[PDB]
């Protein structure tokens, strides 16, 4: 806390004097309204403050006071089902306090101080505590929110609040040190929350959608990009992961968005259903939301506030799914600041920190054993969103130089009515190699081969419509009309996943193994059939194409028998065609 005054004002930039002993990046409170800002420079007896909000109207001479702390986030009960802007302010409370428009200098709290939470203590006096350990528990919707010792804190427990109903402000646990621990702590957003140990991508991130699960899968805590261009169903695909992923919590930061793009999220989400519970998915999601004209600084903090929040929920030992969209828009924000900081524009319309930072953020991803000992993860799915349809964007390069997979969406596929519109030729996965052990162990000894056989027929389908393209389908050997026709079968019955469907909405590795194995079974019985003088067209008449066709629609529980009988029907129906 240091007490200076405004010496100069030029736009969002302010020079405070007399702020002696102020520190780099500490948050300041500027003018009589107490507008929030950061010290970006210390020169003698003056501090250059970058004001997060519109300064217009401020007069030289007004108070400027240091909060003594860098930009931080409040980490406790109160965030789930919440809607924050890019610097952790609840937009709901703001609306209530100020109305339809956002008034500058409004001071609400990330975590509601009035709400009572049901404390269940898990430590007694004399107990030793280290950072990250569980002090106790509090219900938050479905989740057993763990109250954590801030990292960095430790000592012996002196007293503890008995089970009861408290607010987040109350010292539920007090140390011999005198240190008071509450249901929350604050934490600086640009500093990775510590973990005990960072783990290998040797586990699947289960998304529910076959093509990404089987074809371009991500490890638990991996990262991944999607190019969300219009025409393809970005929303839907994105929303599906939130619903059906092996993740306990979903943080969706999105800032720098079109007001109606963004609004399409605060209205759609409250209507999604949690398949695990039967109630809203909002009750296990934090959304940070931000718009074109909302302040530069929040649009850039956005993914950081979101990654810290994501890290906190990781730290309690859950899997956390974070999707930021749009990541290019974030980058736009990082450009503007760079310019405002009057920095000389780098080559190709972005500051040269762009990559570095895409990584200080992206590399905070990872699956970890937390400070508390539990295991947890943050798997990031960023969107790269340039309507220019240019993969050239230094943004896309840097991102892709870094993520472990790319799920290339394509409005072209959407137009054909193929969903979710991901392109198997454009997309890829980097994690695949080290997930095979888990696969062989958890899906079937012969997982990789079967999926390898599938992507292999895909390539070949892809490179046949190409030599049908310039020499007609007449010039096709028999084995070709087949290759194309199963490539077909895989497209319609294996890459297509109905997202609004009560069953096909989700598919697990086991069912995905079955639907695969059937295709290749049918395939190799046709392979030995044409070679034996059987009509490919007669092959293509077989009523067991429909047992395949209508498999993705069959209950997950009813599938094992459906697979076992259908596998048996591929034999008899082909053995019948002498």
């Amino acid at each position: 806390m240091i007490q200076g005054v405004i010496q100069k004002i030029a736009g969002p930039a302010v020079i405070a004097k007399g702020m002696l002993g102020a520190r780099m990046y500490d948050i300041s409170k500027v003018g009589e309204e107490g507008l929030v800002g950061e010290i970006i420079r210390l020169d003698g007896d003056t501090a250059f403050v970058q004001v997060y909000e519109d300064t217009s109207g401020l007069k030289v001479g007004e108070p400027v006071v240091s909060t003594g702390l860098p930009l931080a986030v409040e980490l406790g009960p109160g965030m789930l089902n919440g809607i924050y802007d890019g610097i952790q302010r609840p937009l709901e409370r703001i609306r209530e306090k100020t109305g339809i428009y956002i008034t500058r200098g409004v001071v609400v709290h990330a975590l509601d101080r009035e709400k009572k939470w049901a404390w269940t203590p898990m430590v007694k006096p004399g107990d030793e505590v280290r950072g990250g350990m569980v002090l106790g528990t509090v219900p938050e919707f479905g989740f057993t929110h763990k109250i954590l010792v801030p990292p960095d804190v430790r000592g012996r427990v002196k007293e503890v609040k008995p089970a009861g109903e408290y607010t987040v402000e109350e010292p539920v646990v007090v140390l011999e040190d005198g240190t008071e621990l509450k249901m929350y702590h604050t934490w600086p957003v640009r500093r990775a929350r510590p973990v005990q140990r960072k783990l290998d991508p040797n586990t699947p991130f289960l998304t529910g959608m076959r093509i990404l699960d089987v074809l371009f899968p991500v490890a638990m805590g991996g990262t991944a990009a999607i190019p969300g261009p219009f025409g393809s169903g970005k929303s839907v695909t994105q929303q599906s992961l939130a619903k059906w992923s092996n993740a306990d919590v979903v943080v969706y930061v999105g800032s720098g968005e079109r007001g109606n793009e963004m609004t399409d999220v605060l209205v759609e989400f409250p209507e999604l259903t949690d398949p695990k519970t039967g109630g809203p998915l909002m009750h296990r999601t934090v959304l940070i939301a931000n718009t074109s004209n909302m302040p530069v600084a929040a649009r850039e903090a956005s993914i950081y506030v979101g990654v810290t929040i994501a890290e906190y929920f990781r730290d309690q030992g859950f899997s956390v799914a974070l999707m930021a969209d749009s990541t290019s828009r974030w980058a736009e924000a990082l450009r503007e600041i760079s310019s405002r900081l009057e920095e000389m524009p780098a080559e190709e319309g972005y500051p040269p920190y762009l990559a570095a930072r895409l990584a200080a953020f992206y590399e905070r991803a990872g699956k970890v054993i937390t400070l508390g000992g539990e295991e947890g993860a943050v798997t990031i799915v960023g969107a790269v969103s340039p309507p220019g349809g240019d993969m050239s964007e230094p943004v896309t390069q840097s991102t892709l130089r870094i993520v472990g997979a790319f799920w290339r969406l394509d409005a072209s596929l959407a137009f054909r009515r193929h969903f979710p519109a991901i392109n198997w030729n454009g997309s890829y996965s980097l994690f695949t190699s080290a997930l095979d052990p888990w696969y062989r162990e958890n899906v079937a000894e012969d997982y990789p081969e079967l999926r390898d056989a599938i992507s292999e027929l895909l390539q070949r389908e892809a490179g046949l419509q190409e030599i049908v393209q310039l020499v007609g389908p007449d010039a096709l050997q028999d084995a070709e009309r087949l290759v194309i026709e199963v490539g077909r079968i895989i497209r319609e019955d294996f890459l297509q996943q109905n997202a609004y469907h009560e069953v096909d909405a989700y598919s697990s590795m086991k069912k995905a193994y079955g639907i695969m194995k059937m295709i290749l079974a049918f395939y190799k019985e046709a392979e030995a059939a044409i070679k034996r003088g059987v009509s490919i067209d007669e092959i293509l008449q077989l009523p067991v194409l429909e047992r395949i066709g209508r498999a993705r629609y069959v209950s997950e529980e009813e599938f094992p028998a459906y697979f076992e009988e259908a596998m048996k029907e591929i034999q008899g129906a082909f053995k019948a065609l002498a």
């Binding site: 004002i9 030029a10 519109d54 007069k59 079109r258 399409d264 931000n290």
Partner: protein, 460 residues
């Protein structure tokens, strides 16, 4: 009231005043010269040493000995009421219709405020423009920003003027009571020539379109800062009529290129190092603060809808002006030079055009219930018809089957009849009727994006 006479320096648009710690940053100021003439400026920087004022008009006449600055107001505000209809102002919003200066129910910061995202509302109702290519294919929906992408030469003024005359809300299609539904046009012209002003006035009077509009006309020869203020004045009056008076407002902003051209200028003259292709680094944010002042809000019957209009410098959709406007607005309508020679007006080709909020503005209760599908077919069947044109193009004619011959004559007449309507005001029904008699050129089984029954209704 204070006069500040301690002027230490004048250069370009900037003047410096000593001992002015009491002027607020962003304050509008008055500046009088020896001759007695008075001039506007704005405090763009303030310190203990001095305040830098950026003068509005030329600097000719000012000196350091007989010049005094004084506070006009701490923030630029606008005298606004709902009696601004039929009126006609300039850059700074002072009257130009030879009528009396008006009485305001409030003075609003013309800079406005960002809407709280949580207080918004998916835009849902459509606005009938009277142009089939807009209405049927690329529907403007209430609360949207959908700009026209044009070209120097091309007739945007005419389209601007036309949508202004034709546009209307369709309550009878939504059952809605017409009371909480007045419809107004806020026209904002940036850097127009006397010849074009003459036109827009003429056009607003000719059929009484004026009576429900508020014009903010700014000329090319006006002091450039007035160009920066125009869109702000307009949107101030628009947010006001919309969100306190339940007006559905349609804001037309022509010509945004002149706006952006003024934005940078005010920066070549404020020192600033230019960004991509040489406009201001924060041009994205600035435009955002304009375009984003549109939409619809929970608990309010009214709306603000924008149609910015911009001539791309060399038909280069990748130019900063259209490129950035593109990342902020919700699609666009594009004016094909291609349709301009073939004698077609309004030269709007549907395939590069797109209205991203469309699918939520058409349909049962909003328009007619075949709409959505019919629009998609109409697309599909033109895309499908255009790609055949490329197949049988430069080298040899008549490389075509029977059916693809017929998707072909569906492209010729889709221009002549659909796209080429001149100055007809076509209701959504008439648009869907022509659409349907254009479709039925194809056989039934080819209309694949349409539910089987709809066909039988409007096809026969």
């Amino acid at each position: 009231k204070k006069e500040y006479t301690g002027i230490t320096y004048i250069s370009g648009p900037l003047l410096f005043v000593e001992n002015a710690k009491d002027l607020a940053y962003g304050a509008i100021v008055d500046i009088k010269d020896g001759t007695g003439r008075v001039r506007g400026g704005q405090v763009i920087e303030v310190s203990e040493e001095y305040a830098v004022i950026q003068v509005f008009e030329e600097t000719t006449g000012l000196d350091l000995a007989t010049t005094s600055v004084s506070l006009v107001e701490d923030v630029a505000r606008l005298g606004v009421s709902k009696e601004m209809l039929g009126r006609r102002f300039n850059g700074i919003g002072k009257p130009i219709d030879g009528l009396p200066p008006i009485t305001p129910e409030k003075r609003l910061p013309i800079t406005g405020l960002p809407l709280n995202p949580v207080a918004r509302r998916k835009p849902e109702q459509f606005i009938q423009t009277g142009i089939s290519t807009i209405d049927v294919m690329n529907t403007l929906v209430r609360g949207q920003k959908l700009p026209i992408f044009s070209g120097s030469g091309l007739p945007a003024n005419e389209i601007a003027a036309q949508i202004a005359r034709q546009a209307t809300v369709r309550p009878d299609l939504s059952g809605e009571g017409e009371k909480e539904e007045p419809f107004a046009v806020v026209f904002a012209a940036m850097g127009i020539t006397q010849r074009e002003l003459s036109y827009f006035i003429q056009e607003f009077e000719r059929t009484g379109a004026l009576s429900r509009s508020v014009l903010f006309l700014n000329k090319a020869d006006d002091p450039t800062i007035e160009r920066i203020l125009t869109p702000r004045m307009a949107l101030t009056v628009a947010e006001y009529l919309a969100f306190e008076h339940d007006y559905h407002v349609l804001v037309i902003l022509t010509d945004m290129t002149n706006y952006s051209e003024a934005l940078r200028e005010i920066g070549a003259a404020r020192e600033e190092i230019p960004g991509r292709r040489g406009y201001p680094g924060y041009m994205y944010t600035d435009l955002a603060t304009i375009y984003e002042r549109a939409g619809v809000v929970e608990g309010k019957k009214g709306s603000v809808t924008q149609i910015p209009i911009l001539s791309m410098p060399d038909d280069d959709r990748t130019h900063p002006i259209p490129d950035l406007t593109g990342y902020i607005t919700e699609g666009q309508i594009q004016l094909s030079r291609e349709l301009h020679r073939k004698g077609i007006y309004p030269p709007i080709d549907p395939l590069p055009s797109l209205s991203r909020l469309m699918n939520n503005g058409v349909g049962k209760g909003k328009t007619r219930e075949d709409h959505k599908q019919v629009s998609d077919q109409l697309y599909s069947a033109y895309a499908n018809g255009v790609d055949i044109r490329k197949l049988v193009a430069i080298i040899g004619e008549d490389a075509l089957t029977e059916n693809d011959r017929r998707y072909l004559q569906f492209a010729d007449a889709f221009e002549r009849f659909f796209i080429n309507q001149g100055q007809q005001n076509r209701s959504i029904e008439e648009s869907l009727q022509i659409a349907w008699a254009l479709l039925s050129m194809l056989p039934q089984g080819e209309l694949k994006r349409i539910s089987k029954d709809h066909i039988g209704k409007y096809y026969g």
